[PDB]
């Protein structure tokens, strides 16, 4: 997946970024755990998009709501990642 | 640009899928008020930024799981049309996952406000 | 309080299903409660106890979802041959990450305290 490599790039960098910076181990945890939290969901979204694909040829509101909600869940986690990182980096 | 157009389309799928989660389910609105209040509550109450995050990240996280549950109940509904007999365990376990996050949020908030207050 | 409370019964009957119907779920399940108790027995910063637990619980919340995914595949892949067998595999992948996070969290957090 090219977008998974696009987000995959986003995640590993952010992890590495949190590591070069000297910061409280607690905050390093929060930075990494926040970005990692995004990584777990995207995979689950990848997991959902996999099942939805297995059954059904046509469009549905029952089918596409699942993908759209799946795409929605990923979005929120990234906001958290953005917000978490913002509030945490605001102090420094 | 054509690498950044892929990202705005995901935002559109997210928005149309969030409002889908929002409108189609009444139970999703009950956590949202709890979450927005608790987030705003966590924002106006003065505490160290790490603790705000932990308060917010617990509260925001409960909301995140519920979205996945809405995604599962959507999938189970799809099989509700192709198949005839549903097992319901997926919905039942999905409902179980949501609970745990709230426990965490409560516990997170309990332990966090106890420490400071 | 009755409109939503049926879900709490749905949680229990769906959890007692998760506990009993799946045997492998108990190996991490035993591990988390231990990890929680351990995190509680250690005298530590309240924030870190949260972080230890919030890290360990995060594994737990996700794993139930894998049980939820593995359930859907079972109704479908009951008599059919799936090319999309990966959905279970992606589910197992998310859990691994959570445990990695937990390990790293506990690794990095316990390094700090000691």
Residue numbers in the entry:
A (entry chain C): 28 to 119
B (entry chain B): 4 to 120
C (entry chain A): 7 to 120
What wording appears in the published article?
The structure of a wild-type and a fully functional, thermostable variant was determined recently to 3.7 Å and 2.05 Å, respectively, using crystals grown in meso. The two DgkA constructs gave almost identical results in this study. The renaturation hypothesis was tested by mixing monoolein with a solution of denatured DgkA* dissolved in acidic urea and then bathing the spontaneously-assembled mesophase in denaturant-free buffer. Thus, the simple process of mesophase formation and bathing with excess denaturant-free solvent facilitated a transformation from unfolded kinase monomers in denaturant solution to membrane integral, refolded and properly assembled trimers with full enzymatic activity. Likewise, the refolded wild-type DgkA* was crystallized in meso using 9.9 MAG or 7.8 MAG as host lipids. Crystals in 9.9 MAG diffracted to 4 Å. A complete data set to 3.8 Å was obtained with crystals grown in 7.8 MAG and was used for structure determination. The structure of the refolded wild-type DgkA* is virtually identical (RMSD, 0.419 Å) to the 3.7 Å structure recorded for the untreated, reference wild-type enzyme.
DgkA is a homo-trimeric kinase involved in phospholipid metabolism in Gram negative bacteria. The smallest known kinase, it consists of four helices, three of which are either fully or partly membrane embedded while the fourth resides at the membrane surface. DgkA is a promiscuous enzyme and, in addition to using diacylglycerol as a substrate, it can also phosphorylate the mesophase forming monoolein. Having long served as a model for studies of membrane protein folding, assembly and stability, DgkA was chosen as the test protein.
